[PDB]
Design a binder for this molecule. Structure first.
Ligand SMILES: NCCCCCC(O)(P(=O)(O)O)P(=O)(O)O
Ligand SMILES: [Cl-]
Ligand SMILES: [Mn+2]
Ligand SMILES: [Mn+2]
Ligand SMILES: [Mn+2]
Ligand SMILES: [Mn+2]
Length: 294
C-alpha cells in the first residue's frame, strides 16, 4: 500500500493530540521537495520579484508535501513542491510576467497528460462572526480545489467526473480540521497582519470565535482545539464506513486514505514551519542551496 515513505516515530514529534489516530509518514525523498521549492524561489526572484530564503512549504525537519503527501510519486515530487511554493507565494500576495508558469504546465504534460489537464482544469476559480458561516468560506480560502488537483496528480489518480460532486462531501471534516489548524498556527502571523492594514477584524477562526463567544484569545484557542479534535473523529468515522464500497473509486478511496496524512502532516509541519515559526532555521542542506546552490 505504501512504498515511498516511512512512518515517523511518535516519541520524536509533538502532535498536541491534534491528530489522534493518524501515523506520520515522511516522503523519503524530501530533498526533492527542497529542490523543487527553491527553484521556484529562484524563478520568482528571476521573473517577478525578490525571493530569497522564503518561508513556505519547507521545514528543516518536516517540509510540507514530504510529510503531507509522503507517498507522492518520486518523479513528480519536485514539480509538486514547485507548485506548492508558488501557491504559498500567491497567497502572501493575497494576504506582470507571471503567466510564464506554463513551463510548469508544460512540465506536466511531459509526465501525465490527462492528470495534468484535470488538475489544471481543476484550478478554475469578509469579516465573519459566527463559525457556521466562516466554515464555508475558509474551507476554500485554504485551497480545497488546488490541493485536490495537486494530490491526484502526484498520486496519479483518475477519478471519474461524477464522484467529483461526491468526494468533497466526504472530506468536510478533514478540510475543516486543517483549516482550523492553520488558523491556530498562522494566527499570530495573520493577526499581526490585520493589525497593520488597520482592520477591525481578522479573517481567522480564532477571531470569529472570540466574537461569537464573547471570549478572549485564550478562550478561542481551547475551543478551536477542542473542535479540531472532534472533526478529526468525524472524518475518521468516514474512513471505516467507506473502507469497502466498490461503487467508490479505487482512486477516491485511495485519495481519501491519503488525506489522513495531510492532516497529520499539517500538524507537525505547522508546529515547525519557519513560515509560522520564524525562530526556526533551515537545514545546512536547505540553505546551501538557497544561498549558493540549486
Ligand atoms: N494546504 C495547506 C496550506 C495552508 C496555508 C494556509 C494559508 O495559506 P497561511 O495561513 O499559511 O497564509 P491561508 O492564508 O490560506 O490561511
Ligand atoms: Cl503532543
Ligand atoms: Mn505524542
Ligand atoms: Mn495566508
Ligand atoms: Mn491566504
Ligand atoms: Mn492562515
Amino acid at each position: 500500500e505504501f512504498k515511498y515513505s516511512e512512518v515517523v516515530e511518535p516519541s520524536t514529534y509533538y502532535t498536541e493530540g491534534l491528530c489522534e489516530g493518524i501515523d506520520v509518514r515522511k516522503s523519503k525523498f524530501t530533498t526533492l521537495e527542497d529542490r523543487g521549492a527553491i527553484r521556484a524561489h529562484e524563478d520568482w526572484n528571476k521573473h517577478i520579484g525578490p525571493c530569497r530564503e522564503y518561508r513556505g512549504t519547507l521545514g528543516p525537519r518536516f517540509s510540507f508535501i514530504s510529510v503531507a503527501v509522503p507517498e507522492c510519486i518520486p518523479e513528480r515530487l519536485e514539480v509538486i513542491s514547485y507548485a506548492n511554493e508558488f501557491a504559498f507565494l500567491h497567497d502572501d500576495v493575497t494576504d506582470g510576467k507571471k503567466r510564464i508558469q506554463s513551463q510548469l504546465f508544460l512540465e506536466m504534460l511531459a509526465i501525465d497528460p490527462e492528470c495534468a489537464k484535470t488538475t489544471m482544469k481543476s484550478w478554475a476559480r469578509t469579516r465573519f462572526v459566527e463559525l457556521a458561516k466562516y466554515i464555508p468560506y475558509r474551507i476554500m480560502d485554504v485551497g480545497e480545489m488546488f490541493w485536490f488537483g495537486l494530490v491526484t496528480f502526484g498520486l496519479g489518480l483518475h477519478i471519474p467526473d461524477h464522484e467529483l460532486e461526491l468526494c468533497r462531501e466526504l472530506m468536510a471534516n478533514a478540510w475543516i480540521a486543517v483549516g482550523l489548524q492553520n488558523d491556530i498556527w498562522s494566527w499570530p502571523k495573520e493577526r499581526d497582519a490585520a493589525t497593520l492594514h488597520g482592520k477591525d477584524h481578522v479573517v481567522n477562526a480564532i477571531w470569529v470565535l472570540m466574537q461569537e463567544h464573547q471570549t478572549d484569545v485564550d478562550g478561542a484557542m481551547q475551543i478551536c482545539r477542542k473542535l479540531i479534535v472532534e472533526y478529526v473523529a468525524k472524518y475518521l468515522e468516514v474512513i471505516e464506513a467507506t473502507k469497502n464500497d466498490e461503487s467508490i473509486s479505487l482512486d477516491l478511496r485511495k485519495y481519501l486514505d491519503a488525506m489522513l496524512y495531510s492532516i497529520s502532516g499539517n500538524v507537525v509541519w505547522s508546529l515547525e514551519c519557519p513560515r509560522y515559526n520564524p525562530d526556526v532555521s533551515f537545514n545546512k542542506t536547505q540553505l546551501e542551496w538557497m544561498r549558493q546552490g540549486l
